[PDB]
């Protein structure tokens, strides 16, 4: 059922998982050498 499950999954997903992947990914791209 959605109400009892989805908040407890998506709040860490959007506030811990997605930030981690996004920052790591952006770091890897920004520091990626032009060549």
């Amino acid at each position: 059922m959605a109400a009892s499950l989805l908040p407890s999954i998506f709040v860490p997903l959007v506030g811990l998982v997605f930030p981690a992947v996004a920052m790591a990914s952006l770091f890897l791209y920004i520091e990626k050498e032009q060549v």
Partner: protein, 31 residues
């Protein structure tokens, strides 16, 4: 009356498709 679980998950799947389309638009912009 609360929303049914099927309603929430259908809207969430539509959101996932919308997010895919947003990624397509972002990649196209980056070109």
């Amino acid at each position: 009356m609360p929303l049914s679980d099927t309603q929430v998950f259908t809207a969430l799947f539509v959101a996932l498709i919308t997010g895919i389309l947003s990624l397509r638009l972002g990649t196209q912009l980056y070109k």
